[PDB]
Amino acid sequence: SHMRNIIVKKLDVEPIEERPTEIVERKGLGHPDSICDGIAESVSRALCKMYMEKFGTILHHNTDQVELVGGHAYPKFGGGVMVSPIYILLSGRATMEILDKEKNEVIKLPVGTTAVKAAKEYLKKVLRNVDVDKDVIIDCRIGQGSMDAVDVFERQKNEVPLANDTSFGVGYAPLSTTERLVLETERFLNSDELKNEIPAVGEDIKVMGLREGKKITLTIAMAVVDRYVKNIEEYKEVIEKVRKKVEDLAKKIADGYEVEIHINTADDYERESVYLTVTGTSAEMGDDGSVGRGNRVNGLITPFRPMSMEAASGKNPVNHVGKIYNILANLIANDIAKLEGVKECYVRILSQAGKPINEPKALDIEIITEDSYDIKDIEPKAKEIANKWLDNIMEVQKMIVEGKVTTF
Amino acid sequence: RNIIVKKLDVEPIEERPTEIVERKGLGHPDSICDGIAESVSRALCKMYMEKFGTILHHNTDQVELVGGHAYPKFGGGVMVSPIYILLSGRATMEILDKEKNEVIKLPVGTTAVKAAKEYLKKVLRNVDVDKDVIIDCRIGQGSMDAVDVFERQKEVPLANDTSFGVGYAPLSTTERLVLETERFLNSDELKNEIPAVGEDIKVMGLREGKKITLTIAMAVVDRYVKNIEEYKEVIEKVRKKVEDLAKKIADGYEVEIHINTADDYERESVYLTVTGTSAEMGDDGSVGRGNRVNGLITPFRPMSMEAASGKNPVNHVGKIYNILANLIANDIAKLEGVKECYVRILSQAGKPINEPKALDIEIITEDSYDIKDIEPKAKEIANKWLDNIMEVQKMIVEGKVTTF
Numbered sequence: 001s002h003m004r005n006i007i008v009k010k011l012d013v014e015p016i017e018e019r020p021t022e023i024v025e026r027k028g029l030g031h032p033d034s035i036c037d038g039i040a041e042s043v044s045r046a047l048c049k050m051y052m053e054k055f056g057t058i059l060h061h062n063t064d065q066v067e068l069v070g071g072h073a074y075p076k077f078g079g080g081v082m083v084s085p086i087y088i089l090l091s092g093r094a095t096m097e098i099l100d101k102e103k104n105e106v107i108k109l110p111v112g113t114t115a116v117k118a119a120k121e122y123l124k125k126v127l128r129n130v131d132v133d134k135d136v137i138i139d140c141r142i143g144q145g146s147m148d149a150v151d152v153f154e155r156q157k158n159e160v161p162l163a164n165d166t167s168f169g170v171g172y173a174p175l176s177t178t179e180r181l182v183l184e185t186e187r188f189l190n191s192d193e194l195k196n197e198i199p200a201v202g203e204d205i206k207v208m209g210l211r212e213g214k215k216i217t218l219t220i221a222m223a224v225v226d227r228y229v230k231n232i233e234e235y236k237e238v239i240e241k242v243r244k245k246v247e248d249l250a251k252k253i254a255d256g257y258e259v260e261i262h263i264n265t266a267d268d269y270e271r272e273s274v275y276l277t278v279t280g281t282s283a284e285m286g287d288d289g290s291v292g293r294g295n296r297v298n299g300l301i302t303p304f305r306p307m308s309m310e311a312a313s314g315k316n317p318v319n320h321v322g323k324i325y326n327i328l329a330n331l332i333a334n335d336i337a338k339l340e341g342v343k344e345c346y347v348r349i350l351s352q353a354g355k356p357i358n359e360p361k362a363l364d365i366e367i368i369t370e371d372s373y374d375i376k377d378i379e380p381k382a383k384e385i386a387n388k389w390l391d392n393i394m395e396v397q398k399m400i401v402e403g404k405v406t407t408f
Numbered sequence: 409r410n411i412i413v414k415k416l417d418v419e420p421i422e423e424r425p426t427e428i429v430e431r432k433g434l435g436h437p438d439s440i441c442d443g444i445a446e447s448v449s450r451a452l453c454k455m456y457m458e459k460f461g462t463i464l465h466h467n468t469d470q471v472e473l474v475g476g477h478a479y480p481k482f483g484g485g486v487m488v489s490p491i492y493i494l495l496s497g498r499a500t501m502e503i504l505d506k507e508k509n510e511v512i513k514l515p516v517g518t519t520a521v522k523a524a525k526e527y528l529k530k531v532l533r534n535v536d537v538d539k540d541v542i543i544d545c546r547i548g549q550g551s552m553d554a555v556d557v558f559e560r561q562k563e564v565p566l567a568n569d570t571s572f573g574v575g576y577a578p579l580s581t582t583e584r585l586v587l588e589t590e591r592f593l594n595s596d597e598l599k600n601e602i603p604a605v606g607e608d609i610k611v612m613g614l615r616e617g618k619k620i621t622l623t624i625a626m627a628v629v630d631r632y633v634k635n636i637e638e639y640k641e642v643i644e645k646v647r648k649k650v651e652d653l654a655k656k657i658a659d660g661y662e663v664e665i666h667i668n669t670a671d672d673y674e675r676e677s678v679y680l681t682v683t684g685t686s687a688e689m690g691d692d693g694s695v696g697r698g699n700r701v702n703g704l705i706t707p708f709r710p711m712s713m714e715a716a717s718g719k720n721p722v723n724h725v726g727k728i729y730n731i732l733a734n735l736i737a738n739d740i741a742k743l744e745g746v747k748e749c750y751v752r753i754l755s756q757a758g759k760p761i762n763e764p765k766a767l768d769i770e771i772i773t774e775d776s777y778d779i780k781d782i783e784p785k786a787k788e789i790a791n792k793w794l795d796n797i798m799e800v801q802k803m804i805v806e807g808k809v810t811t812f
């Protein structure tokens with residue numbers, strides 16, 4: 001068969017849980033930076049579908065550039081005022097026109113309209129209390145490039161792309177208790193099920209987890225929607241209702257740790273200086289956002305784990321090696337961590353320029369073994385998983401386009 | 409104070425088999441955005457100080473660069489579509505005179521737009537700011553809640569948010585090579601000698617064992633190269649200079665230097681620019697996409713995702729703690745017995761900036777040294793810095809530290 005550049009090594013260090021400290025952050029769906037990542041990736045997905053429908057392949061584009069300018073608002077118990085809309089600028093580049101010299105024809109594609117529509121539909125989905133007709137302006141300066149039909153023909157072969165570069169991706173698994181608690185706290189508080197029970201909870205949620213030994217302090221920033229709280233008393237009730245939900249979640253998935261929960265810690269209840277919003281996001285006035293300043297593709301910010309600085313959101317899922325490798329590294333690590341005997345796993349991938357993207361210069365697998373396991377019994381299974389995913393790298397591309405994996 | 413010191417027993421970065429490090433130089437679009445953002449904050453600080461004797465709330469850590477278009481040509485090309493730059497962020501836009509019962513507007517927008525143009529003029533020798541660039545401004549008023557926290561103790565300020573900064577020391581050989589290569593090639597002395605060198609220089613260092621491969625993407629300014637031959641001569645002249653640098657600071661390593669590797673001499677298709685930045689080529693930028701405050705991008709080191717550039721130097725811990733962690737790590741690495749030091753600092757929103765929720769220190773010890781002998785010394789350093797935390801603000805305002 002085929003031999004790739006895969007390295008497996010035993011990593012003989014303390015695993016993450018046994019280290020004394022951990023810090024983990026997540027910017028939730030309605031956080032201005034996360035809004036920008038989500039729009040960036042939504043626009044790419046929409047363009048991919050546009051290209052697939054017309055040509056049966058995906059053409060060059062990158063929409064990993066989105067700027068969110070905070071609006072103007074005046075929150076008030078019982079329902080505040082949205083004064084000036086949130087301004088969002090879409091940027092990047094996308095293939096717009098195909099020049100066919102053989103036929104005497106030009107094909108033009110709906111790049112700008114597709115982008116603006118995709119952005120608006122994304123905001124509609126995730127921001128329950130934002131009226132996208134009146135509360136948002138979506139502007140577009142996405143570059144519109146041209147391309148020869150003959151190069152479209154080549155792309156329609158849908159062969160495995162060549163790496164154009166020496167690029168790097170890194171991932172790991174499993175998530176620690178603290179990581180899982182931070183991730184699932186945000187996910188739960190932004191789930192439809194919680195919203196329906198406590199509509200006052202906005203989507204701009206930020207969760208910080210500090211572990212000291214076996215004590216996890218969770219600090220939650222949570223935008224409250226002011227039409228659902230008539231006074232400071234009802235605001236407090238919302239905080240305490242959430243505090244209890246999060247307590248129950250901590251019992252469910254971090255049993256055995258001491259968990260301490262703090263919510264909206266900059267509040268001053270008595271002065272009524274609290275985290276009230278009209279729309280459920282501080283994008284309405286308090287804060288601004290842009291792409292690549294938040295969660296990594298695993299959904300977390302983790303200064304005790306290796307992190308890539310590349311912004312995956314909005315990059316071409318068909319040719320951008322960095323995006324594909326950071327996602328792939330995460331997927332491979334996740335499967336290797338499910339193997340019997342693996343306590344902890346790191347996967348690093350480095351491309352070989354001029355070579356197919358599933359023929360990397362190096363793919364390094366670091367494994368912390370459980371007690372009484374031999375790295376050499378695990379290695380064959382681990383290499384098989386890595387080779388499985390590399391064989392199916394085009395499947396990964398498809399998963400990105402269909403939104404089956406996360407970019408933030 | 410919540411200071412925590414731990415021994416860290418892992419392989420030191422220099423001894424690991426592989427290292428990858430990157431620096432986005434001054435004229436790279438992402439770095440243009442970081443530097444503009446910080447320029448705007450510095451100018452607003454000065455304006456607020458002039459009018460009120462104090463810095464008012466702002467955070468202009470938002471700048472979006474939309475690439476323009478150009479037509480490079482040997483001996484000098486021309487710009488075709490202007491680079492569009494949007495200044496954004498929060499700022500104190502107005503003051504309420506409760507006596508007159510009138511709103512008074514502050515010159516935020518004029519100050520911001522001028523600061524941005526002056527910064528661009530500083531870093532891009534060959535840009536024409538009247539023709540090649542559009543600078544727009546949509547900075548807006550921040551929420552009153554954040555303004556109150558800002559004012560409550562702006563003696564020792566309260567932390568604006570719950571965030572963390574990170575820093576480490578010392579730099580590895582590969583990190584220093586990458587950092588100093590960019591700094592040298594964008595030094596005034598070098599560009600005076602080789603004016604064909606544009607400021608958009610991206611340097612990536614890949615170490616494998618004792619081999620360091622340096623990949624450089626360097627914009628060449630087309631008014632200073634009359635033909636393809638002169639272009640080649642610039643490449644080889646820069647190459648020689650970097651070789652000499654690598655002999656100085658990477659002694660004992662095999663260093664390969666690769667410059668502008670996508671060049672196609674057969675088709676005369678090379679990295680030529682009119683302005684010295686890829687921003688003219690449709691490439692985009694925004695803030696916090698690039699270097700950390702130590703000037704580097706390092707996936708083999710801890711990083712904070714906070715973007716220091718443009719954040720206010722009074723109470724934004726995303727700026728202050730990233731600088732502070734670097735200062736602390738640097739001093740601890742000086743200690744005999746410390747091989748590597750990692751510092752992570754976490755705030756709690758509303759608490760004084762010199763009362764972090766956690767100030768976390770990890771130390772890889774030199775062989776045979778006891779962390780027990782080191783711990784007290786490390787703690788003292790961290791406490792000394794927390795005692796002197798207003799020096800951070802002062803160093804930042806005086807322009808004595810970098811934010812990227």
Ligand SMILES: COc1cc(C[S@@+](CC[C@@H](N)C(=O)O)C[C@H]2O[C@@H](n3cnc4c(N)ncnc43)[C@H](O)[C@@H]2O)c([N+](=O)[O-])cc1OC
Pocket residue numbers: 031032204205206221222264265266267274275276282286287288466467498499550551553554557568569570757
């Ligand atoms: C942590 O405290 C507070 C923290 C913040 C920080 S937000 C950004 C700071 C910056 N854009 C600024 O100009 O102030 C950044 C993020 O913090 C969250 N946030 C916004 N308002 C908040 C609030 N009232 N309380 C807690 N978190 C909030 C939200 O997720 C935002 O994206 C604010 N604030 O700027 O109005 C204001 C607070 O209030 C003192």
Ligand SMILES: [Mg+2]
Pocket residue numbers: 033288289293
């Ligand atoms: Mg942000």
Ligand SMILES: [Mg+2]
Pocket residue numbers: 438692693697
């Ligand atoms: Mg970039």
Ligand SMILES: [Mg+2]
Pocket residue numbers: 571713714715726
């Ligand atoms: Mg931050």
